[PDB]
Enzyme design. Structure first.
Site, mmCIF file in Angstrom:
data_model
loop_
_atom_site.group_PDB
_atom_site.id
_atom_site.type_symbol
_atom_site.label_atom_id
_atom_site.label_comp_id
_atom_site.label_asym_id
_atom_site.label_seq_id
_atom_site.Cartn_x
_atom_site.Cartn_y
_atom_site.Cartn_z
ATOM 1 N N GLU A 112 -1.838 -13.822 0.766
ATOM 2 C CA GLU A 112 -1.050 -12.808 0.064
ATOM 3 C C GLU A 112 0.263 -12.519 0.790
ATOM 4 O O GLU A 112 1.261 -12.182 0.157
ATOM 5 C CB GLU A 112 -1.845 -11.508 -0.075
ATOM 6 C CG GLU A 112 -3.063 -11.596 -0.988
ATOM 7 C CD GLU A 112 -4.295 -12.197 -0.321
ATOM 8 O OE1 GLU A 112 -4.902 -13.120 -0.905
ATOM 9 O OE2 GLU A 112 -4.664 -11.752 0.785
ATOM 10 N N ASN A 113 0.249 -12.659 2.115
ATOM 11 C CA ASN A 113 1.401 -12.369 2.966
ATOM 12 C C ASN A 113 2.227 -13.597 3.358
ATOM 13 O O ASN A 113 3.062 -13.526 4.265
ATOM 14 C CB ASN A 113 0.922 -11.666 4.234
ATOM 15 C CG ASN A 113 0.155 -10.391 3.939
ATOM 16 O OD1 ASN A 113 0.401 -9.716 2.934
ATOM 17 N ND2 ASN A 113 -0.782 -10.054 4.819
ATOM 18 N N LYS A 166 0.826 -1.210 0.000
ATOM 19 C CA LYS A 166 0.000 0.000 0.000
ATOM 20 C C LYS A 166 0.864 1.266 0.000
ATOM 21 O O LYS A 166 0.539 2.246 -0.673
ATOM 22 C CB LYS A 166 -0.946 0.012 1.207
ATOM 23 N N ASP A 218 -4.469 -10.920 11.866
ATOM 24 C CA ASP A 218 -4.866 -11.744 10.714
ATOM 25 C C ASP A 218 -3.704 -12.048 9.765
ATOM 26 O O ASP A 218 -2.828 -11.206 9.561
ATOM 27 C CB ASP A 218 -6.006 -11.081 9.933
ATOM 28 C CG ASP A 218 -5.626 -9.718 9.368
ATOM 29 O OD1 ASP A 218 -4.840 -9.000 10.021
ATOM 30 O OD2 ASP A 218 -6.122 -9.362 8.278
ATOM 31 N N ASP A 224 4.374 -9.846 7.023
ATOM 32 C CA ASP A 224 3.483 -8.675 7.126
ATOM 33 C C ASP A 224 3.804 -7.821 8.370
ATOM 34 O O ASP A 224 4.714 -8.156 9.127
ATOM 35 C CB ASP A 224 2.007 -9.104 7.104
ATOM 36 C CG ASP A 224 1.647 -10.044 8.233
ATOM 37 O OD1 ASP A 224 2.364 -10.072 9.257
ATOM 38 O OD2 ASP A 224 0.632 -10.758 8.099
ATOM 39 N N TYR A 277 14.855 -12.389 0.544
ATOM 40 C CA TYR A 277 14.276 -12.726 -0.757
ATOM 41 C C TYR A 277 13.707 -14.135 -0.681
ATOM 42 O O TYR A 277 14.369 -15.046 -0.190
ATOM 43 C CB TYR A 277 15.342 -12.612 -1.852
ATOM 44 C CG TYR A 277 14.986 -13.228 -3.188
ATOM 45 C CD1 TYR A 277 13.882 -12.795 -3.908
ATOM 46 C CD2 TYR A 277 15.781 -14.225 -3.746
ATOM 47 C CE1 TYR A 277 13.564 -13.349 -5.135
ATOM 48 C CE2 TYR A 277 15.474 -14.787 -4.973
ATOM 49 C CZ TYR A 277 14.364 -14.347 -5.666
ATOM 50 O OH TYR A 277 14.057 -14.912 -6.887
HETATM 51 C C1 LIG Z 1 10.376 -7.164 7.437
HETATM 52 C C2 LIG Z 1 8.977 -7.800 7.301
HETATM 53 C C3 LIG Z 1 8.163 -7.324 6.077
HETATM 54 C C4 LIG Z 1 8.280 -6.037 5.513
HETATM 55 C C5 LIG Z 1 7.508 -5.691 4.406
HETATM 56 C C6 LIG Z 1 6.623 -6.631 3.869
HETATM 57 N N1 LIG Z 1 5.789 -6.363 2.787
HETATM 58 C C7 LIG Z 1 5.922 -6.920 1.601
HETATM 59 S S1 LIG Z 1 7.054 -7.971 1.027
HETATM 60 C C8 LIG Z 1 6.654 -8.235 -0.481
HETATM 61 C C9 LIG Z 1 7.217 -9.003 -1.495
HETATM 62 C C10 LIG Z 1 8.302 -10.033 -1.388
HETATM 63 C C11 LIG Z 1 9.301 -10.078 -0.379
HETATM 64 C C12 LIG Z 1 10.251 -11.094 -0.429
HETATM 65 N N2 LIG Z 1 10.231 -11.995 -1.404
HETATM 66 C C13 LIG Z 1 9.329 -12.001 -2.389
HETATM 67 N N3 LIG Z 1 9.436 -13.040 -3.357
HETATM 68 C C14 LIG Z 1 8.682 -13.192 -4.561
HETATM 69 C C15 LIG Z 1 7.358 -12.861 -4.713
HETATM 70 C C16 LIG Z 1 6.707 -13.072 -5.926
HETATM 71 C C17 LIG Z 1 7.394 -13.634 -7.007
HETATM 72 C C18 LIG Z 1 6.688 -13.875 -8.344
HETATM 73 N N4 LIG Z 1 7.235 -14.368 -9.469
HETATM 74 N N5 LIG Z 1 6.269 -14.431 -10.413
HETATM 75 N N6 LIG Z 1 5.132 -13.987 -9.871
HETATM 76 N N7 LIG Z 1 5.391 -13.647 -8.601
HETATM 77 C C19 LIG Z 1 8.712 -13.981 -6.852
HETATM 78 C C20 LIG Z 1 9.356 -13.775 -5.649
HETATM 79 C C21 LIG Z 1 8.343 -11.011 -2.402
HETATM 80 C C22 LIG Z 1 5.391 -7.409 -0.793
HETATM 81 O O1 LIG Z 1 4.807 -7.370 -1.859
HETATM 82 N N8 LIG Z 1 4.950 -6.599 0.524
HETATM 83 C C23 LIG Z 1 3.817 -5.720 0.638
HETATM 84 C C24 LIG Z 1 6.494 -7.896 4.441
HETATM 85 C C25 LIG Z 1 7.264 -8.246 5.539
#
Ligand SMILES: CCc1ccc(/N=C2\S/C(=C\c3ccnc(Nc4ccc(-c5nnn[nH]5)cc4)c3)C(=O)N2C)cc1
Length: 249
Positions: free
Chosen positions: A134-135, A17, A130, A148, A86
């Site tokens: 998604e998270n 957001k 919750d 999250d 990651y």
């Molecule tokens: C420190 C705790 C925290 C801080 C911020 C956060 N908010 C996030 S993280 C995040 C995305 C994210 C973090 C770490 N790793 C990934 N890996 C990943 C995701 C999707 C795909 C993919 N490939 N093809 N389609 N999708 C590949 C890798 C994604 C996010 O969106 N928010 C809001 C959540 C926890």
């Protein structure tokens, strides 16, 4: 310690957001990681500078393989950056869309992995609100990772939170009930076409199972989704639950 010049920025990995997350590599170490950008003016527009600050201070102290790790954070004139673990295999939400629904082994495994993360949190006096698909992200070996902001649509909120009563550790167990349901069935248990209805159905714990849901699963989910928080089983009782041990890795 850190600055943006220290990183090479890759493709977007998700949209929050308050800003996006990007794949990035620390230049000298070549360490792959994720980097969440947050706009400062946008933060102040919704007044959450010290909702987020306490939040960061918390999960720095949290180390567990089923929780997404926060390595560090920094800022500049306009933005705030969070250095994240990651998670190669993406979100559970995405997996559940591709697959429609999960089998019992997968579900029971994820539930165990969650329950262990929450047990770790509760042992360190940290409670969670919750939890949405998604998270939930996936590590390199398919391991589930909670990601999250909290840490202490209604479809995932328990009755006590929507009815305006004392939130508590027992919220977590409600979350496991909803997720366990959603994993098996492919949608959450109190899904309605209006908020007003979803509210009403959660307050009554008014939900039903498709025929295919086994009785082991029915038992666990029914026990977790009890309206009275104190009647919901302990996290230890979930991990020990027969259906969980019967199916989980
Ligand atoms: C420190 C705790 C925290 C801080 C911020 C956060 N908010 C996030 S993280 C995040 C995305 C994210 C973090 C770490 N790793 C990934 N890996 C990943 C995701 C999707 C795909 C993919 N490939 N093809 N389609 N999708 C590949 C890798 C994604 C996010 O969106 N928010 C809001 C959540 C926890």
């Amino acid at each position: 310690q850190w600055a943006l010049e220290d990183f090479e920025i890759g493709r977007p990995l998700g949209k929050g957001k308050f800003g996006n997350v990007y794949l990035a590599r620390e230049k000298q170490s070549k360490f792959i990681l994720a980097l969440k950008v947050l706009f400062k003016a946008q933060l102040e527009k919704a007044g959450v500078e010290h909702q987020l600050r306490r939040e960061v201070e918390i999960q720095s102290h949290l180390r567990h393989p089923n929780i997404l790790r926060l390595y560090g954070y920094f800022h500049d004139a306009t933005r705030v950056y969070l250095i994240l673990e990651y998670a190669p295999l993406g979100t559970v939400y995405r997996e559940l869309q591709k697959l429609s629904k999960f089998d019992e082994q997968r579900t029971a495994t994820y539930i165990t992995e969650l329950a262990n993360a929450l047990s770790y949190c509760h042992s360190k006096r940290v409670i969670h609100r919750d939890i949405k698909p998604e998270n939930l992200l996936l590590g390199s070996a398919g391991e589930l990772k909670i990601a999250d902001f909290g840490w202490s649509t209604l479809d995932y909120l328990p009755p006590e939170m929507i009815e305006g009563r004392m939130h508590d550790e027992k919220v977590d167990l409600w979350s496991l009930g909803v997720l366990c349901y959603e994993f098996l069935v492919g949608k959450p248990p109190f899904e309605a076409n209006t908020y007003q209805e979803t509210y009403k159905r959660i307050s009554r714990v008014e939900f039903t199972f498709p025929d295919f849901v086994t009785e082991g699963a029915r038992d666990l989910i029914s026990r977790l989704l009890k309206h009275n928080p104190s009647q919901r089983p302990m996290l230890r009782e979930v991990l020990e639950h027969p259906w969980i041990t019967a199916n989980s890795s």
